[PDB]
Amino acid sequence: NKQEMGTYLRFIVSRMKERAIDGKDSKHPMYRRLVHSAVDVPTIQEKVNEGKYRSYEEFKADAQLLLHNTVIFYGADSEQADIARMLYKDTCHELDELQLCKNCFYLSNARPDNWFCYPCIPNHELVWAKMKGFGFWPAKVMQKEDNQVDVRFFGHHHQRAWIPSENIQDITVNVHRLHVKRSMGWKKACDELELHQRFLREGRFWKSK
Numbered sequence: 442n443k444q445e446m447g448t449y450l451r452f453i454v455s456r457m458k459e460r461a462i463d464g465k466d467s468k469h470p471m472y473r474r475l476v477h478s479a480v481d482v483p484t485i486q487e488k489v490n491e492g493k494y495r496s497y498e499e500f501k502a503d504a505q506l507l508l509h510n511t512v513i514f515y516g517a518d519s520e521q522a523d524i525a526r527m528l529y530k531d532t533c534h535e536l537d538e539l540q541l542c543k544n545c546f547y548l549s550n551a552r553p554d555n556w557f558c559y560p561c562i563p564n565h566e567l568v569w570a571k572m573k574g575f576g577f578w579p580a581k582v583m584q585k586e587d588n589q590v591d592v593r594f595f596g597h598h599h600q601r602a603w604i605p606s607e608n609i610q611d612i613t614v615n616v617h618r619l620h621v622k623r624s625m626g627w628k629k630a631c632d633e634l635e636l637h638q639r640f641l642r643e644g645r646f647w648k649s650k
């Protein structure tokens with residue numbers, strides 16, 4: 442876990458680092474004056490590297506505190522607050538995604554060749570799903586509730602979307618039957634689906650080092 446925490450947090454901080462520049466920063470003389478506890482991205486990045494976070498909750502609390510200071514120092518209605526709010530949301534979203542499936546999260550960030558084809562445990566349910574404007578594309582189910590399913594599509598972008606349950610078909614349905622445009626992109630996604638299914642059958646699990 443401690444090794445995993447390190448690499449996962451590094452992925453998140455790296456992503457949080459850029460949308461954090463735009464930049465005139467919380468180093469006014471009044472920063473001392475309005476802000477209780479000090480923190481910035483470099484401090485967080487150091488704490489990640491030195492293994493200072495005991496849990497993801499402690500990391501999240503530092504991200505929250507950074508948001509709180511920005512709000513206090515610039516005002517809740519300020520544009521700096523808007524940006525910092527989006528930063529915090531994005532950070533917490535990554536933590537959500539990590540919790541959803543650690544293996545998906547690692548592969549999605551590290552992106553080795555054919556990253557989306559490696560199996561997870563438990564295996565993700567596979568479906569055909571259509572979005573408004575599109576025909577059916579193959580996808581992995583990440584989670585679901587009664588009236589909708591959270592999927593990540595095969596192919597370009599590997600688009601993440603909520604799909605109404607009525608727009609889902611079992612992966613065992615015959616492709617030729619239902620509606621979709623057989624574009625090059627769609628065929629590429631179907632190839633990726635098949636390669637994923639082959640890796641599953643092979644027991645070809647992702648191996649680091």
Ligand SMILES: [Zn+2]
Pocket residue numbers: 542543544545546561562565
């Ligand atoms: Zn997964």
